[PDB]
A = this chain, B = another copy of it.
Amino acid sequence: KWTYFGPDGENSWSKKYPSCGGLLQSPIDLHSDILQYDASLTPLEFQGYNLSANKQFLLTNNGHSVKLNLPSDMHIQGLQSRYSATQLHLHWGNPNDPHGSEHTVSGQHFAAELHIVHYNSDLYPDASTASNKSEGLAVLAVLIEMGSFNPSYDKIFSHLQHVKYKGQEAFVPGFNIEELLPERTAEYYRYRGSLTTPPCNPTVLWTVFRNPVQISQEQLLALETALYCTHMDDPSPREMINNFRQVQKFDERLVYTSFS
């Protein structure tokens, strides 16, 4: 029903998902003219991020990205409610243009981006219910650049061959999800925005960490080449590349920083 390329791509999302042409759209370019330091922003705390190795967590190719289900005990503290892991997923580019982050910083794309999606567990019973309601969701964005091999991201990437096609699922043993975050999480950008995919609901509080993490060139190539958007038995298989939205207009509004 929607894609990132061709007729059903992002310029046409608004047809069946009005909100994709509505208010508070994400992602955005983070640049000096729209930033303002807010001394009252607090470091987040990641409570229940260290998942038991004796437990397993479902990895799914949903046709648009790869997601890992996360438990609702996993949560935070630092916003104006409690916000609870639902899943994480990634966005990336392609081997010819390996620059597929969603947010940009001073016009620069990063190689990829990790999103850790939570929901307002104080106001709503689950993520789906929260998704189209006030204050529903909160997403952590980690920018990814090419560099040294990252064993923590390999805890995900080493399973990708078991979820090659849409609808395929496989389990991942628990590991410490905090290992996927950067240094100095205390420094971040924060703004009110949207889901970056249909239905584009304007109900997410974004936190984009200032500092990127690194993965190796080999890990990045593996991610860009592992997956397909189509199901087994689809007559036209389509490789899963360039699964990021273009940056949106951001006018008469501010991104707040926890760093001066």
Question: B-facing mask of A1-17, CB < 8 A → 1, else 0?
Answer: 00011110111111100
A61 proximal to B (CB < 8 A): no
Contact of A134 with B by CB under 8 A: no
Task: Say yes or no: B246 contacts A242, CB within 8 Å.
Answer: no
Cα A98 to Cα B246 with chains together (Å): 20
Q: How many copies does the complex hold?
A: 2
A120: interface (CB < 8 Å): no
Q: Which residue of B lies closest to A96 (CB)?
A: B33
Q: Which chain A residues numbered 30 to 49 have a C-beta less than 8 Å away from chain B?
A: 31, 33-34
Cβ–Cβ contact A34 & B97, under 8 A:
yes
A233 within 8 A of partner (CB): no
A7 touches B22 (CB 8 A): yes
A77 at the interface (CB under 8 A from B): no
Interface presence of A260 (CB below 8 A): no
Which listed segment binds B: A99-107, A121-129, A160-168? A99-107
Q: A226: shortest Cβ distance to chain B, in Å?
A: 18
Q: Apart from A14-B14, A97-B251, what are 20 other A-B pairs with CB-CB below 8 Å? A: A4-B249, A5-B249, A5-B251, A7-B21, A7-B22, A9-B249, A10-B11, A10-B249, A11-B11, A11-B14, A11-B20, A11-B25, A15-B15, A31-B99, A33-B97, A96-B252, A241-B251, A242-B249, A246-B247, A246-B249
Interface residues of A (CB under 8 A from B): 4-7, 9-15, 20-23, 25, 31, 33-34, 94, 96-99, 104, 106-109, 241-242, 246-249, 251-252
